[PDB]
C-alpha cells in the first residue's frame, strides 16, 4: 500500500537500479573524501577516519538494499551523476581548499543525503526501511565534524564559503531535476526532497554563522 508501483515490477526495479547506485556511489565518495580531508586536516585524522569508515558501512547497507530487491545497480550512471560535484571537490582538494571541500561534502551532500533518506523511509520496503533508518540514526548520533569545523573557523572561512556555495549549489538543483523521474517511481516527490534539503542546508548555514538574509540568498542560488 506504500507505492503506486509494486516493488517487484520492472518499472520499480529499473528506477531503483539508478537511485540505489546513486546512494552507493555517494557513500563510496564520502568514504574517499573524508580520508582525503584527513590529509588536509591531520590534527583531526582520527575523527575524519571514523566518519569515512562509517560511510563505508552505510554503503554496504545500501548495497544490501539493492540485493534484497533483486536489483543490479547502475554504477556508471551514478558516477556521471556525481561528476560535477566530485570534480569540484577534487579540484578544491588539490588546491588545499579545505573550506570548499567541507562545504561540498559536510554541508551540501550531507543535507542532500539526509533529505533523500528521510523521504525514502516512509515508502521503502520493510528491509530497506530498517537499513535506512539505521543510517539516519547514525548521522544523528555523530557530530557533523565539517559543520563544526566551519563554525569554529567561520570568520576566516566566510568569503570562501559564499564562493563555494555559488559554484556548487546550482549542481544540486541539476541533480534533483535529473533524478526526479526515477525518484517519483520510488514514491519520492521532488517538492519534499527540495524542502528537506533546504531546511537541512539552511539550518547548517545558520549554525555555522550565516544570517537569515544571507541564508535566503545562498540556499536559493541558481534555482
Amino acid at each position: 500500500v506504500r507505492t503506486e508501483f509494486d516493488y517487484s515490477s520492472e518499472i520499480y526495479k529499473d528506477a531503483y537500479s539508478r537511485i540505489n547506485a546513486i546512494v552507493i556511489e555517494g557513500e563510496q565518495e564520502a568514504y574517499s573524501n573524508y580520508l582525503q580531508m584527513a590529509e588536509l586536516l591531520p590534527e583531526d585524522k582520527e575523527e575524519l577516519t571514523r566518519l569515512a569508515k562509517m560511510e563505508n558501512r552505510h554503503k554496504k547497507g545500501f548495497q544490501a538494499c539493492g540485493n534484497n530487491l533483486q536489483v543490479n545497480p547502475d554504477m556508471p550512471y551514478a558516477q556521471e551523476f556525481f561528476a560535477g560535484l566530485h570534480g569540484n571537490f577534487q579540484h578544491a582538494f588539490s588546491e588545499g581548499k579545505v573550506v570548499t571541500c567541507l562545504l561540498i561534502q559536510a554541508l551540501i551532500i550531507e543535507a542532500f543525503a539526509i533529505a533523500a533518506y528521510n523521504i525514502y523511509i516512509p515508502v521503502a520496503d520493510d528491509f530497506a526501511r530498517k537499513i535506512t533508518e539505521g543510517v539516519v540514526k547514525d548521522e544523528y548520533t555523530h557530530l557533523n565534524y565539517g559543520e563544526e569545523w566551519l563554525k569554529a573557523n567561520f570568520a576566516t572561512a566566510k568569503e570562501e564559503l559564499e564562493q563555494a556555495n555559488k559554484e556548487n549549489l546550482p549542481l544540486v538543483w541539476k541533480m534533483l531535476n535529473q533524478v526526479q523521474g526515477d525518484a517519483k517511481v520510488l514514491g519520492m516527490e521532488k517538492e519534499a526532497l527540495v524542502e528537506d534539503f533546504m531546511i537541512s542546508y539552511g539550518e547548517a548555514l545558520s549554525n555555522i554563522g550565516f544570517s537569515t538574509r544571507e541564508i535566503m540568498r545562498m540556499s536559493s542560488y541558481g534555482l
Side-chain angles (χ1 to χ4, degrees), residues 95-116:
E95 292 172 315
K97 297 191 190 322
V98 287
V99 170
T100 293
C101 289
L102 286 177
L103 177 135
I104 293 172
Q105 179 67 56
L107 306 188
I108 289 188
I109 285 295
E110 183 83 20
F112 199 161
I114 300 174

PDB file of all heavy atoms in Angstrom, residues 95-116:
ATOM      1  N   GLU A  95      44.029  21.985  -4.420  1.00  0.00           N
ATOM      2  CA  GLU A  95      44.485  23.342  -4.124  1.00  0.00           C
ATOM      3  C   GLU A  95      44.564  23.608  -2.619  1.00  0.00           C
ATOM      4  O   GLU A  95      44.871  24.722  -2.189  1.00  0.00           O
ATOM      5  CB  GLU A  95      43.547  24.364  -4.791  1.00  0.00           C
ATOM      6  CG  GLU A  95      43.620  24.353  -6.299  1.00  0.00           C
ATOM      7  CD  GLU A  95      42.565  25.225  -6.947  1.00  0.00           C
ATOM      8  OE1 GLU A  95      41.389  25.159  -6.526  1.00  0.00           O
ATOM      9  OE2 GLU A  95      42.918  25.971  -7.883  1.00  0.00           O
ATOM     10  N   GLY A  96      44.286  22.587  -1.807  1.00  0.00           N
ATOM     11  CA  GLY A  96      44.276  22.754  -0.363  1.00  0.00           C
ATOM     12  C   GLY A  96      43.122  23.587   0.183  1.00  0.00           C
ATOM     13  O   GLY A  96      43.205  24.114   1.310  1.00  0.00           O
ATOM     14  N   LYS A  97      42.039  23.687  -0.591  1.00  0.00           N
ATOM     15  CA  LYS A  97      40.872  24.479  -0.192  1.00  0.00           C
ATOM     16  C   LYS A  97      39.908  23.661   0.670  1.00  0.00           C
ATOM     17  O   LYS A  97      38.851  23.219   0.202  1.00  0.00           O
ATOM     18  CB  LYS A  97      40.168  25.066  -1.419  1.00  0.00           C
ATOM     19  CG  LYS A  97      41.026  26.048  -2.222  1.00  0.00           C
ATOM     20  CD  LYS A  97      40.166  26.774  -3.253  1.00  0.00           C
ATOM     21  CE  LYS A  97      41.013  27.579  -4.239  1.00  0.00           C
ATOM     22  NZ  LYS A  97      42.177  28.230  -3.574  1.00  0.00           N
ATOM     23  N   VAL A  98      40.306  23.465   1.932  1.00  0.00           N
ATOM     24  CA  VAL A  98      39.538  22.700   2.919  1.00  0.00           C
ATOM     25  C   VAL A  98      38.116  23.209   3.071  1.00  0.00           C
ATOM     26  O   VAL A  98      37.173  22.421   3.170  1.00  0.00           O
ATOM     27  CB  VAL A  98      40.219  22.732   4.320  1.00  0.00           C
ATOM     28  CG1 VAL A  98      41.430  21.879   4.330  1.00  0.00           C
ATOM     29  CG2 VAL A  98      40.618  24.134   4.707  1.00  0.00           C
ATOM     30  N   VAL A  99      37.967  24.530   3.099  1.00  0.00           N
ATOM     31  CA  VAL A  99      36.660  25.148   3.272  1.00  0.00           C
ATOM     32  C   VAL A  99      35.698  24.712   2.177  1.00  0.00           C
ATOM     33  O   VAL A  99      34.564  24.305   2.458  1.00  0.00           O
ATOM     34  CB  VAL A  99      36.777  26.679   3.327  1.00  0.00           C
ATOM     35  CG1 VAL A  99      35.397  27.336   3.263  1.00  0.00           C
ATOM     36  CG2 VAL A  99      37.519  27.096   4.600  1.00  0.00           C
ATOM     37  N   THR A 100      36.143  24.780   0.926  1.00  0.00           N
ATOM     38  CA  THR A 100      35.284  24.372  -0.173  1.00  0.00           C
ATOM     39  C   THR A 100      34.970  22.878  -0.103  1.00  0.00           C
ATOM     40  O   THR A 100      33.819  22.464  -0.332  1.00  0.00           O
ATOM     41  CB  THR A 100      35.926  24.721  -1.537  1.00  0.00           C
ATOM     42  OG1 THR A 100      35.987  26.150  -1.676  1.00  0.00           O
ATOM     43  CG2 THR A 100      35.108  24.140  -2.671  1.00  0.00           C
ATOM     44  N   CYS A 101      35.976  22.066   0.229  1.00  0.00           N
ATOM     45  CA  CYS A 101      35.772  20.628   0.335  1.00  0.00           C
ATOM     46  C   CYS A 101      34.730  20.294   1.399  1.00  0.00           C
ATOM     47  O   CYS A 101      33.860  19.447   1.177  1.00  0.00           O
ATOM     48  CB  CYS A 101      37.087  19.936   0.679  1.00  0.00           C
ATOM     49  SG  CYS A 101      38.289  19.908  -0.655  1.00  0.00           S
ATOM     50  N   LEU A 102      34.812  20.978   2.537  1.00  0.00           N
ATOM     51  CA  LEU A 102      33.882  20.751   3.633  1.00  0.00           C
ATOM     52  C   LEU A 102      32.472  21.208   3.258  1.00  0.00           C
ATOM     53  O   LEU A 102      31.490  20.537   3.605  1.00  0.00           O
ATOM     54  CB  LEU A 102      34.359  21.472   4.902  1.00  0.00           C
ATOM     55  CG  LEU A 102      35.557  20.810   5.588  1.00  0.00           C
ATOM     56  CD1 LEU A 102      36.000  21.623   6.783  1.00  0.00           C
ATOM     57  CD2 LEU A 102      35.209  19.393   6.035  1.00  0.00           C
ATOM     58  N   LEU A 103      32.358  22.343   2.569  1.00  0.00           N
ATOM     59  CA  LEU A 103      31.027  22.816   2.177  1.00  0.00           C
ATOM     60  C   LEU A 103      30.386  21.773   1.265  1.00  0.00           C
ATOM     61  O   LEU A 103      29.216  21.412   1.428  1.00  0.00           O
ATOM     62  CB  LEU A 103      31.051  24.204   1.509  1.00  0.00           C
ATOM     63  CG  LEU A 103      29.661  24.669   1.027  1.00  0.00           C
ATOM     64  CD1 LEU A 103      29.382  26.117   1.406  1.00  0.00           C
ATOM     65  CD2 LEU A 103      29.529  24.495  -0.481  1.00  0.00           C
ATOM     66  N   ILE A 104      31.156  21.276   0.306  1.00  0.00           N
ATOM     67  CA  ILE A 104      30.621  20.284  -0.622  1.00  0.00           C
ATOM     68  C   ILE A 104      30.235  18.972   0.061  1.00  0.00           C
ATOM     69  O   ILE A 104      29.115  18.481  -0.123  1.00  0.00           O
ATOM     70  CB  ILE A 104      31.600  19.996  -1.760  1.00  0.00           C
ATOM     71  CG1 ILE A 104      31.757  21.237  -2.652  1.00  0.00           C
ATOM     72  CG2 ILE A 104      31.116  18.801  -2.584  1.00  0.00           C
ATOM     73  CD1 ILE A 104      32.864  21.092  -3.699  1.00  0.00           C
ATOM     74  N   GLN A 105      31.134  18.414   0.864  1.00  0.00           N
ATOM     75  CA  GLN A 105      30.854  17.112   1.461  1.00  0.00           C
ATOM     76  C   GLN A 105      30.027  17.193   2.737  1.00  0.00           C
ATOM     77  O   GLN A 105      28.995  16.523   2.842  1.00  0.00           O
ATOM     78  CB  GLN A 105      32.150  16.339   1.733  1.00  0.00           C
ATOM     79  CG  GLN A 105      31.898  14.964   2.384  1.00  0.00           C
ATOM     80  CD  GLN A 105      31.184  13.984   1.457  1.00  0.00           C
ATOM     81  OE1 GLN A 105      31.645  13.712   0.354  1.00  0.00           O
ATOM     82  NE2 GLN A 105      30.071  13.441   1.918  1.00  0.00           N
ATOM     83  N   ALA A 106      30.462  18.006   3.699  1.00  0.00           N
ATOM     84  CA  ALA A 106      29.839  18.021   5.025  1.00  0.00           C
ATOM     85  C   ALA A 106      28.525  18.806   5.093  1.00  0.00           C
ATOM     86  O   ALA A 106      27.700  18.569   5.988  1.00  0.00           O
ATOM     87  CB  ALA A 106      30.826  18.522   6.068  1.00  0.00           C
ATOM     88  N   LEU A 107      28.321  19.737   4.160  1.00  0.00           N
ATOM     89  CA  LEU A 107      27.088  20.530   4.143  1.00  0.00           C
ATOM     90  C   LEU A 107      26.152  20.123   3.005  1.00  0.00           C
ATOM     91  O   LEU A 107      25.053  19.609   3.241  1.00  0.00           O
ATOM     92  CB  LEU A 107      27.399  22.027   4.045  1.00  0.00           C
ATOM     93  CG  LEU A 107      28.358  22.615   5.081  1.00  0.00           C
ATOM     94  CD1 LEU A 107      28.386  24.143   4.959  1.00  0.00           C
ATOM     95  CD2 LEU A 107      27.953  22.188   6.480  1.00  0.00           C
ATOM     96  N   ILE A 108      26.583  20.339   1.767  1.00  0.00           N
ATOM     97  CA  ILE A 108      25.725  20.070   0.614  1.00  0.00           C
ATOM     98  C   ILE A 108      25.327  18.589   0.495  1.00  0.00           C
ATOM     99  O   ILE A 108      24.133  18.271   0.491  1.00  0.00           O
ATOM    100  CB  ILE A 108      26.379  20.547  -0.690  1.00  0.00           C
ATOM    101  CG1 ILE A 108      26.382  22.074  -0.734  1.00  0.00           C
ATOM    102  CG2 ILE A 108      25.641  19.970  -1.889  1.00  0.00           C
ATOM    103  CD1 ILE A 108      26.844  22.659  -2.081  1.00  0.00           C
ATOM    104  N   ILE A 109      26.305  17.694   0.392  1.00  0.00           N
ATOM    105  CA  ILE A 109      25.998  16.277   0.185  1.00  0.00           C
ATOM    106  C   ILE A 109      25.291  15.676   1.391  1.00  0.00           C
ATOM    107  O   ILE A 109      24.317  14.948   1.238  1.00  0.00           O
ATOM    108  CB  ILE A 109      27.260  15.459  -0.194  1.00  0.00           C
ATOM    109  CG1 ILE A 109      27.660  15.744  -1.640  1.00  0.00           C
ATOM    110  CG2 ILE A 109      27.017  13.958  -0.025  1.00  0.00           C
ATOM    111  CD1 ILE A 109      26.638  15.268  -2.658  1.00  0.00           C
ATOM    112  N   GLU A 110      25.767  16.007   2.587  1.00  0.00           N
ATOM    113  CA  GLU A 110      25.153  15.532   3.820  1.00  0.00           C
ATOM    114  C   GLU A 110      23.674  15.921   3.874  1.00  0.00           C
ATOM    115  O   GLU A 110      22.822  15.101   4.237  1.00  0.00           O
ATOM    116  CB  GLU A 110      25.910  16.078   5.035  1.00  0.00           C
ATOM    117  CG  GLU A 110      25.401  15.590   6.381  1.00  0.00           C
ATOM    118  CD  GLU A 110      25.949  14.232   6.766  1.00  0.00           C
ATOM    119  OE1 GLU A 110      26.990  13.823   6.208  1.00  0.00           O
ATOM    120  OE2 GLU A 110      25.340  13.579   7.640  1.00  0.00           O
ATOM    121  N   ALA A 111      23.361  17.160   3.499  1.00  0.00           N
ATOM    122  CA  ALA A 111      21.962  17.609   3.523  1.00  0.00           C
ATOM    123  C   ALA A 111      21.117  16.917   2.448  1.00  0.00           C
ATOM    124  O   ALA A 111      19.944  16.574   2.680  1.00  0.00           O
ATOM    125  CB  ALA A 111      21.873  19.131   3.374  1.00  0.00           C
ATOM    126  N   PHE A 112      21.711  16.726   1.275  1.00  0.00           N
ATOM    127  CA  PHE A 112      21.057  16.072   0.149  1.00  0.00           C
ATOM    128  C   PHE A 112      20.757  14.628   0.555  1.00  0.00           C
ATOM    129  O   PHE A 112      19.641  14.132   0.364  1.00  0.00           O
ATOM    130  CB  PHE A 112      22.002  16.117  -1.058  1.00  0.00           C
ATOM    131  CG  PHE A 112      21.337  15.893  -2.401  1.00  0.00           C
ATOM    132  CD1 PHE A 112      21.979  16.300  -3.565  1.00  0.00           C
ATOM    133  CD2 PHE A 112      20.097  15.279  -2.508  1.00  0.00           C
ATOM    134  CE1 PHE A 112      21.393  16.107  -4.810  1.00  0.00           C
ATOM    135  CE2 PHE A 112      19.509  15.075  -3.753  1.00  0.00           C
ATOM    136  CZ  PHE A 112      20.162  15.489  -4.903  1.00  0.00           C
ATOM    137  N   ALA A 113      21.750  13.969   1.144  1.00  0.00           N
ATOM    138  CA  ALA A 113      21.600  12.574   1.558  1.00  0.00           C
ATOM    139  C   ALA A 113      20.514  12.390   2.619  1.00  0.00           C
ATOM    140  O   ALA A 113      19.624  11.534   2.467  1.00  0.00           O
ATOM    141  CB  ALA A 113      22.940  12.021   2.047  1.00  0.00           C
ATOM    142  N   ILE A 114      20.562  13.190   3.683  1.00  0.00           N
ATOM    143  CA  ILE A 114      19.591  13.052   4.757  1.00  0.00           C
ATOM    144  C   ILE A 114      18.181  13.366   4.251  1.00  0.00           C
ATOM    145  O   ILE A 114      17.220  12.715   4.656  1.00  0.00           O
ATOM    146  CB  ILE A 114      19.987  13.862   5.999  1.00  0.00           C
ATOM    147  CG1 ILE A 114      21.344  13.369   6.496  1.00  0.00           C
ATOM    148  CG2 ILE A 114      18.958  13.682   7.105  1.00  0.00           C
ATOM    149  CD1 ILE A 114      21.930  14.175   7.618  1.00  0.00           C
ATOM    150  N   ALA A 115      18.064  14.332   3.343  1.00  0.00           N
ATOM    151  CA  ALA A 115      16.786  14.611   2.692  1.00  0.00           C
ATOM    152  C   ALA A 115      16.259  13.368   1.983  1.00  0.00           C
ATOM    153  O   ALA A 115      15.096  12.969   2.177  1.00  0.00           O
ATOM    154  CB  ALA A 115      16.930  15.766   1.695  1.00  0.00           C
ATOM    155  N   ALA A 116      17.106  12.777   1.148  1.00  0.00           N
ATOM    156  CA  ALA A 116      16.745  11.596   0.378  1.00  0.00           C
ATOM    157  C   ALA A 116      16.316  10.465   1.308  1.00  0.00           C
ATOM    158  O   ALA A 116      15.280   9.824   1.092  1.00  0.00           O
ATOM    159  CB  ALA A 116      17.919  11.155  -0.488  1.00  0.00           C
TER     160      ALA A 116
END
